[PDB]
RNA sequence: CGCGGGGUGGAGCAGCCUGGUAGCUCGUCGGGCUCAUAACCCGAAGGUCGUCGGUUCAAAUCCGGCCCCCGCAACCA
RNA sequence: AAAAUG
RNA sequence: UUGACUGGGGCGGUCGCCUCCUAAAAGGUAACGGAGGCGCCCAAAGGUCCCCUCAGGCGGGACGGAAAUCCGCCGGAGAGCGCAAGGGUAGAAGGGGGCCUGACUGCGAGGCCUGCAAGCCGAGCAGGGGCGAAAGCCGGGCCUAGUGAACCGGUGGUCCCGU
RNA sequence: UCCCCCGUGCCCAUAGCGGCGUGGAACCACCCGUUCCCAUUCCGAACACGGAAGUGAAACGCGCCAGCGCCGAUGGUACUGGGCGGGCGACCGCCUGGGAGAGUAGGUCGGUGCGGGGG
């Protein structure tokens, strides 16, 4: 709860193999890691007393921070909800809180993800940093089955201080990021 | 609406203008009277 | 007679009255305080040394003196009053 | 086919734009007098152009109508004309190169344009090339 | 030339100035009754709302552009 | 004292 | 008593105000010339202090259009600025937040415009206030339309007059 | 005096974009932490405070490059105060002063006051 393996390992284990594998010089020219943004979209805040500040904190538990209720930037008549208010929850884990969450992700969630075979090595596709979305919200150790009253996963982004997806891809293949080659 | 503010317990007017249906009623706010300096001035 | 049958789809007779704008006091003109210097649409001329503008962007002198104009490109065009002796 | 229109007659001064140069094609048709050329005219020329040498080469019509020509219904006065009615036109100042041909013999080309000129309500002149350019 | 009324499932009429819900009768379709047809009975379907776009979160509905449809005026010499 | 045709 | 304009009159259209153009590079400028708005709206859409910066385009991302919400670059303004157009504007007039009510009272140098009478801007002084540590800013709203002399009355108020 | 750097103003793109190497002693930044001040519709990311271990990789500073951007003559015309001819007209032309816009040659990856810290 201050320092965790993933974090730990990253240093006394990942850095090296990387320094070598690729071949750097300044520890800062390295493939640091610094931001994870688990964000939800939900679907609405429409009729029938739709509070949905429920999955709000449901999300908090799975993470640590409180998400920010997101609001509409435009208005679309096509599918209801327009102009303002509405919802689109988001949260930003940095340092500590971040490391851990990932570590919890990469050792319990994904596993267990419905079926699972790996991850999409094309999701970076090149542009530094990654991305991915989970369908179920109950694929987390903290939350329960007798808890969730309705499925609603989301998507999480992650940021690399490196550029080439090559690098980025290595850094995560090392951090334990599985890959459906 | 053509509103004006009657300093409670005296005279004077400010001659404002509210928007009724558009959240109104109970208009009143610190204004400066002629009979010495400030009070609040109600509606009416 | 040999009459016709003309009519008017005229739906254009209209216009607002002129509001006469522009530099009212060009550079070099000695002016007293208050003399509005420029009547402008927007901020066509930014206020400079000893010059203030009000609600309608009308720029006017703040002291007694000569009017001086100035270009500042990316910054804009300014107008001000330089006092004297 | 656009924008807000039914515009002012306006006039044609010196032909400061009456005198370009064969841009594509090989030979050409430059205008000598200023005027408004009704689309009706352009086509009526172009057509006869192609039609002169059935299954021939390419025709380039650099001029292009866009000016709305209005006109009253046969009455008196009361607001601008119904306008258009007949249509649009292009403005040609003495010197502009209206049409230009290519991919054909001069005997065929030259004689082709000559006809066009009869269609246009102006006086024309025919040109070759090798002139202006931006080379060194 | 000008006014003003109107284009909505197959036919004939609502709904539009008071923007979000397309209503009625007839007929089309399925099932009954009858020896059978009608009639009668039960149950369904079916509409780019004339078109080319504009304003709006949203247009049968509000604003302009023509295309056919209908009426009223077009007088003094 | 009684609810069309083939 | 049953208006005027009017390429004769009638019929038709129009009648005040705002914005482009016509308008000929100061203003101003006609025509039954071209083309659109207004007869309202905000108790926050107003003060001030403190923060933030758009629209798009390109990838990457559970449901997910072709822009719902996220992440990453590029993007000086093409967004925004309540409603027409124009000018202005991110070195903010735009987006958000905290306290507020100067959408004050007495005044008003000096000008703009102008036949009149109207309309418009306005520093500064006084009083008693707001926001800011402060310098300071504050007499409504990015700005121009949203309006109507007098007479006759109506409601209040008050030093006045009252045969 | 002439270098280097931290604040700042001015000229307001010839200082821009994008490339290419360099700079850490100083400065500057990034960094080290979140106990206190104060912080983010959730994040000390940004604001902020306390520290200085490590770094010049980011960012900034300083140089070189012309591919993009920006600038840009001279000539020569268009147009034109004023004056003036020809032709029936449509239009054409001269005299006398002014004189672009495009395009060419070419220029440019800055210039410059003020105050500081260091050799």
Curated annotation (Swiss-Prot), chain A:
The keyword DNA repair does not apply. GO terms for biological process: translation. It comes from the Bacteria. GO terms for cellular component: ribonucleoprotein complex; ribosome. One of its GO terms (molecular function) is rRNA binding. HAMAP family: Ribosomal_uL5_B (MF_01333_B). This is Large ribosomal subunit protein uL5. The gene is rplE.
UniProtKB/Swiss-Prot annotation, chain B:
It comes from the Bacteria. Keywords: Ribonucleoprotein, Ribosomal protein, RNA-binding, rRNA-binding, tRNA-binding. GO terms for biological process: translation. GO terms for molecular function: rRNA binding; structural constituent of ribosome; tRNA binding. Disulfide bonds: none annotated. GO terms for cellular component: cytoplasm; ribonucleoprotein complex; ribosome. Found on the solvent side of the large subunit. Contacts the E site tRNA. Part of the 50S ribosomal subunit. Belongs to the bacterial ribosomal protein bL33 family. This is Large ribosomal subunit protein bL33. The gene is rpmG. The chain holds residues 9 to 52 of 54 of the full protein.
Curated annotation (Swiss-Prot), chain C:
The keyword Kinase does not apply. GO terms for biological process: translation. InterPro entries: Ribosomal_bL27 (IPR001684), Ribosomal_bL27_CS (IPR018261). It holds the Pfam family Ribosomal_L27. SUPFAM superfamilies: Ribosomal L27 protein-like. GO terms for cellular component: cytosolic large ribosomal subunit. Keywords: Ribonucleoprotein, Ribosomal protein. This is Large ribosomal subunit protein bL27. It comes from Thermus thermophilus (strain ATCC 27634 / DSM 579 / HB8).
Swiss-Prot record, chain D:
One of its GO terms (molecular function) is tRNA binding. The keyword Transcription does not apply. It holds the Pfam family Ribosomal_L16. Keywords: Ribonucleoprotein, Ribosomal protein, RNA-binding, rRNA-binding, tRNA-binding. One of its GO terms (cellular component) is cytosolic large ribosomal subunit. GO terms for biological process: translation. Part of the 50S ribosomal subunit. Belongs to the universal ribosomal protein uL16 family. This protein binds directly to 23S rRNA. Interacts with the A site tRNA. NCBIfam families: rplP_bact. This is Large ribosomal subunit protein uL16. It comes from Thermus thermophilus (strain ATCC 27634 / DSM 579 / HB8). The gene is rplP.
């Amino acid at each position: 709860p201050l320092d965790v393996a993933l974090k730990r390992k990253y240093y006394e284990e990942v850095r090296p193999e990387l320094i070598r594998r690729f071949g750097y010089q300044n520890v800062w020219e390295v493939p640091r890691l610094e931001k994870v943004v688990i964000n939800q979209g939900l679907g609405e805040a429409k009729e029938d007393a739709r509070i949905l500040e429920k999955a709000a904190q449901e999300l908090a538990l799975i993470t640590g921070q409180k998400p920010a209720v997101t609001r509409a930037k435009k208005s679309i008549s096509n599918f209801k909800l327009r102009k303002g208010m509405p919802i689109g929850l988001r949260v930003t884990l940095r340092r500590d809180r971040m490391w851990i969450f990932l570590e919890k992700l990469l050792n319990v969630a994904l596993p267990r993800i419905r079926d699972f075979r790996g991850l999409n090595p094309n999701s970076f596709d090149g542009r530094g940093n990654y991305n991915l979305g989970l369908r179920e919200q109950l694929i987390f150790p903290e939350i329960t089955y007798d808890m969730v009253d309705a499925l609603r996963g989301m998507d999480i982004a992650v940021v690399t201080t490196a550029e080439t997806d090559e690098e980025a891809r290595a850094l995560l293949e090392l951090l334990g990021f599985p890959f459906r080659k | 609406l053509l509103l004006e503010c009657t300093e409670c317990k005296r005279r004077n007017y400010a001659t404002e203008k509210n928007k009724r249906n558009t959240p109104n009623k109970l208009e009143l706010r610190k204004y400066c009277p002629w009979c010495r300096k400030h009070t609040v001035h109600r509606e009416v | 007679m040999a009459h016709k049958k003309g009519l008017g789809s005229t739906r254009n007779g209209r216009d607002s009255q002129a509001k006469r704008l522009g530099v009212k006091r060009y550079e070099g003109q000695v002016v007293r305080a208050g003399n509005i210097l420029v009547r402008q649409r927007g901020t066509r001329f930014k206020p400079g040394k000893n010059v203030g503008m009000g609600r309608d962007f009308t720029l006017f002198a703040l002291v007694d003196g000569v009017v001086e104009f100035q270009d500042r490109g990316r910054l804009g065009r300014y107008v001000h009053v330089r006092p004297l002796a | 086919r656009m924008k807000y229109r039914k515009q002012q007659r306006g006039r044609l001064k010196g032909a400061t734009k009456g005198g370009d140069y064969v841009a594509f094609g090989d030979y050409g048709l430059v205008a000598l007098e200023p005027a408004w050329i009704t689309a009706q005219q352009i086509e009526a020329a172009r057509v006869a152009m192609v039609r002169h040498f059935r299954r021939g080469g390419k025709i380039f019509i650099r001029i292009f109508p866009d000016k709305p020509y209005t006109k009253k219904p046969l009455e008196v006065r009361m607001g601008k004309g119904k306008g258009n009615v007949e249509g649009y036109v292009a403005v040609v100042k003495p010197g502009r190169v209206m049409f230009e041909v290519a991919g054909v013999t001069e005997e065929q080309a030259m004689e082709a344009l000559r006809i066009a000129g009869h269609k246009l309500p102006i006086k024309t002149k025919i040109v070759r090339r090798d002139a202006y350019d931006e080379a060194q």
